[PDB]
Amino acid sequence: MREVISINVGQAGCQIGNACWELYSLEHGIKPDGHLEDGLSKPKGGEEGFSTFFHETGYGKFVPRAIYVDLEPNVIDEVRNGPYKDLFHPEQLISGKEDAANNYARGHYTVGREILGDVLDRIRKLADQCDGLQGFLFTHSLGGGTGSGLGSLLLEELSAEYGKKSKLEFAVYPAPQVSTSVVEPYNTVLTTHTTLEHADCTFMVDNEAIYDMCKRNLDIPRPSFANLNNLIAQVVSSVTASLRFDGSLNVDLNEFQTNLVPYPRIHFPLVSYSPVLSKSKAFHESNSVSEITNACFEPGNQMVKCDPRDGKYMATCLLYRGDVVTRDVQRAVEQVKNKKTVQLVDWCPTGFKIGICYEPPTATPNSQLATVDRAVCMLSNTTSIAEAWKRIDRKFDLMYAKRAFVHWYVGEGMEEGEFTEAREDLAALERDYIEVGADS
Amino acid sequence: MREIIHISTGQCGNQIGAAFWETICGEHGLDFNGTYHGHDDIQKERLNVYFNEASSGKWVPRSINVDLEPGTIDAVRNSAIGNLFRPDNYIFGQSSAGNVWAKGHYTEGAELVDSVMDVIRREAEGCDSLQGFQITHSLGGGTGSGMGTLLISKIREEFPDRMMATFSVLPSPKTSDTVVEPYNATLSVHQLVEHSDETFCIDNEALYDICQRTLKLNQPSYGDLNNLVSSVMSGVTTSLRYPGQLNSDLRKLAVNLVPFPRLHFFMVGYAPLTAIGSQSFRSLTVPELTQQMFDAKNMMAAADPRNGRYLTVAAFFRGKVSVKEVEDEMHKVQSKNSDYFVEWIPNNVQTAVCSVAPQGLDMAATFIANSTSIQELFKRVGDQFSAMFKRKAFLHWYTSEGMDELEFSEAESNMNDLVSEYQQYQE
Amino acid sequence: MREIIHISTGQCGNQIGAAFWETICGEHGLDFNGTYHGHDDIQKERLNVYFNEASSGKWVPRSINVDLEPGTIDAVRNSAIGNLFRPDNYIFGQSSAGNVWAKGHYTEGAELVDSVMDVIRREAEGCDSLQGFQITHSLGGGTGSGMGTLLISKIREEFPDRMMATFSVLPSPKTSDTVVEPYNATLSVHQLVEHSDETFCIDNEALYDICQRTLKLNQPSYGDLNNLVSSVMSGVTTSLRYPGQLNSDLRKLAVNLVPFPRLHFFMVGYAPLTAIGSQSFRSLTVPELTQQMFDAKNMMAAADPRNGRYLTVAAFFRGKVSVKEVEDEMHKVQSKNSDYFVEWIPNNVQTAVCSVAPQGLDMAATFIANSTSIQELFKRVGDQFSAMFKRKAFLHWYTSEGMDELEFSEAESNMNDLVSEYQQYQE
């Protein structure tokens, strides 16, 4: 039950997962080649990992159980050029013969489920090899309709298959100002329709706010996609650190699910991580975790185009890694009580879900952020995403009424009722988030 | 009935029991390898009470450690006196209940309850003079507050005559971390009021305050707090174990420390709480300890003597102390605090004296109290619970767990009834 | 009548007898070359009982090992104490019976039964004080289940007065690679119930469970199971061989252990079954041995005291044990399990005490019982036979061999009659 299976869907999904396995093997001191290197060395074994994500073979080789699914042959060639393909199994990676469409009209259609059946039995075969499961992990992007399509469909298939394990879906949200592909408004609304069907936990991240942090905090002139994948690899390693390493307050993955979702339906909590500063600035500043908590509450450390100060505050998750001072977190919760900036509704106030990790944080040398011995992760629910979806819903309603792309959609196998149901679902989630916000 | 069984569970109760065993073996004298080192005969009696004599003069501490983590048992094994342990004495499960009382004692606790119950039954078959069960866990953590509650309920259903000494750590209001922490605490105590008969109020914020005012520690760590509570437990168990002028039993506390069987919460305090390095200036006398006991800064509940109304009190002492001194101190504190001391007793007094000297101190003192202040914490946790479940906040997961809101309302009503009983008896 | 003959057959009984001789030599003291090493006279007595005094003080064990494979005799020769053996003591044939009891005791056994009977007749002529015959085989394999059954029938027809104690390994219900295994087992027992006088229930699944719970073995290995059954056999034979407070004969077991002559099965258990490494924590006492014996986890039948009804029991001990302690334990277990203990006995007790200390242990214990679970196992194997031969699967082999469905139904009716005798006598 302790094992965790991760899925990599779409071009950005494989790039995020590759950085995830890169930082993973880097923390435990494992080379990307294999055998080993080295260990299973103090304490790279028990407590797991690396045995939850890195399955140990008969010879001791720690193979990362990941499924790289993408209908683009270029992405399959990219993940095969790296040494992690040698670490991976040829049956773990699923090669894409041809891209369905550009990019979601056919990815979520019958052409998508033709390959999903092959991946489904591969998951069943993988489940027969390694028993036990803690939660389903997903990595994809909303800009790539194939990643969001195959990821949402596979999420629904395993939900109807088991339905007992948690579902952690990482979805990359494009910026509301730039439109890398005009089909994205249709995909994001139809993706919210798939989440209304089945969704346990979805993480919304905006590339615009992340690139703004590299320009301001990391002092990067041109933030690349590799720095974004490394940052996501950092925020996901700190979240799973409660299961990997030891800590005074070990938080279960299902505990994150039963201490985050209040209402009969809410699936989209926001994530924030700190500190994210430059190398020279990290050598010049030696603040404690109290200042990191105060800076993590700011919208700058949110990595998303949403302001937690504007939206009302709900009970959040505050994870710590490294040397944690009980007085500092007591002083941290003392200052936020004295802040009284965000709307403290009568239900949350005594809530900042604490996760303590004795392992110090570790950052990749490629990332401009220096390796710090202390980190704070704030994962909160904020009504700002309802405003962001409303803008996306307004753009989607304008394009849908313009019928410039609906003709191609009904030719691919879509219907007018399907897009309206996704619109009615998205409008219901925004109304629900507003209703649960106005109850203060 | 001199033998006492010790139960350890939860993410904090494991270290609490480890520190308890450390303080016990430091009090009577014993090596971590089981070699007898005490002198001369009473230490063998304490070992027969709390330990088991294995082959080649070995001694194994009679403790039942259970938790949903192998890291916990590994860490308590890495302790000084933590190495030798019978594989049947400790049974740990997988993987986690996740700070939830319902899931803690419904799914993660129901799978390992049979094993630990068989273990405790075999121990009772091997322990003839068992009298009470020392429960050490944290009411803040839902996993511990569920597992220990389930174990206490099963022991009460199995051994209703045996005493239940619970040293659970109450959640702190300053800790604004998990809204499910005080809610799990109140759900667990709603059953512990009927499953347990002796509970001691221990607040984490109280421990932080007492280590920041006396020890002057920059970072309040569980180590020194567990050391303090283990010294308190060692004192209150050597009040009967170690020879003295008068020995106090758990049954003696059940028939003297509490007037009505509904009340089971007792506020504890220890002395002397001397500052680090100021031991040369401190003169161990009776008036200073008496003044320290009736102050809110030395209590670990932590209650204010000016706010609540004293329903009953008790003060136990270890070391060379005179009965006339403590009698005069009690008379003075009754003449000066007649408003706090309730009038229907009319004079509350329960003193035990141990002639033996405490470990490392010339004289030590413990204080137990029952006032009208625990109802204030009950009101606080009830208001937190009510304001936390008006939006179904973090609650639909609990509904899928199987619990209903009617049980929660009944728990709140029982807590309000207990508060009204503590207001009878008004403040 | 102190001398006992040993017969070994089957794919597992060969190693069982090898381990039996190994443990006998390890108990009394002897080299594999026949050199006497015991001290002083009781060891020579055991040697005259079990081994043969050859020239130059050589000692060769009186064992009749037979199997349809030269690899078996080669392996028991390459074993530690397996080098010297008279070529007449062992006779092996070719080639195989195809895991079929009928073929094994009709063709593969009929060609060597004359030779093995001549050998056993010469051995009985040379051995004046022979009392019992210890058979070691596995009821699972058809070849061994046929060979041992034929040998037991022939020895019963030749010397009906000599006792017949069999340690046949019962098949496991989990193993389903060959559906003919339990069917051959029940066809063998249908004749063994009349050809033998005492049989001991030994299940492969029970052995796997006990070794995985005590020794914590990953893969089921026959070595430790054979060593355990060897220790059991050594204990039950030294109950008479080695001096003690009272010696129990095979005739004594026959006239004190079974109420009616139709019953011949006995469920066995051994103690202490201590975990690996916990020997320092374990203290060899009488209550723990009694608990292990009356618990189902230490039984090798394997039976459940809560399910079956105790008809009769017996407990033998080796080492420094107290008669008053064992009497108190028997009284307590009778008062606590009077529901299992049947009322027409009314108090079943049969205790033998050996003053000598066990090899490597301060005290050891064996337990024999007759509950109502053997009839449940009979029902299970009969239902297996019925559900496997309703479809007439692999029945052409037996129709070509020559066995009859009327004979199968007669065997099933005899098993049902035994079940009624064990339910007479309700559960």
Numbering used by the authors:
A (entry chain Ar): 1 to 440
B (entry chain Be), C (entry chain Bf): 1 to 427
Text taken from the publication that reported this structure:
We determined a consensus reconstruction of the native yeast γTuRC, capping the α/β-tubulin lattice at the minus end, to a global resolution of 9.2 Å. In our γTuRC reconstruction, seven γTuSC protomers assemble side-on to generate a pseudo-helical γTuRC at the base of the MT lattice, consisting of 14 spokes (formed by Spc98:γ-tubulin and Spc97:γ-tubulin of γTuSC promoters). As spoke 14 is positioned directly above spoke 1, γTuRC presents 13 γ-tubulin molecules for MT nucleation (spokes 2–14). The geometry of the active γTuRC matches that of a 13-PF MT lattice perfectly, with a helical rise of 84 Å, a helical twist of ~28° and a width of 220 Å. Relative to unassembled yeast γTuSC modules, and γTuSC modules assembled into the open γTuSC filament, the closed ring conformation of native γTuRC requires tightening and tilting of the two γ-tubulin subunits of each γTuSC module, so as to match the lateral α/β-tubulin geometry of the MT lattice. This γ-tubulin interface reorganization is facilitated by straightening of the gamma ring protein 2 (GRIP2) domain of Spc98 and bending of the GRIP2 domain of Spc97. γTuRC ring closure is then accommodated by leaving an empty gap above the Spc97:γ-tubulin spoke 1 of γTuSC-1. Ring closure at the γTuRC seam, which aligns with the MT lattice seam, is achieved through interactions between Spc98:γ-tubulin of γTuSC-7 and the first α/β/α-tubulin row of the MT lattice. The essential Spc110 N-terminus forms a dimeric coiled coil (Spc110NCC) at the base of six γTuSC modules (γTuSC-1 to γTuSC-6). The Spc110NCC bound to the last γTuSC of the ring (γTuSC-7, spokes 13 and 14) also binds to the first γ-tubulin of γTuSC-1 (spoke 1), probably further stabilizing γTuRC ring closure. The γTuRC luminal density is compact and connects multiple γTuSC modules from the inside of the lumen, interacting specifically across inter-γTuSCs interfaces of γTuSC-3 to γTuSC-5.
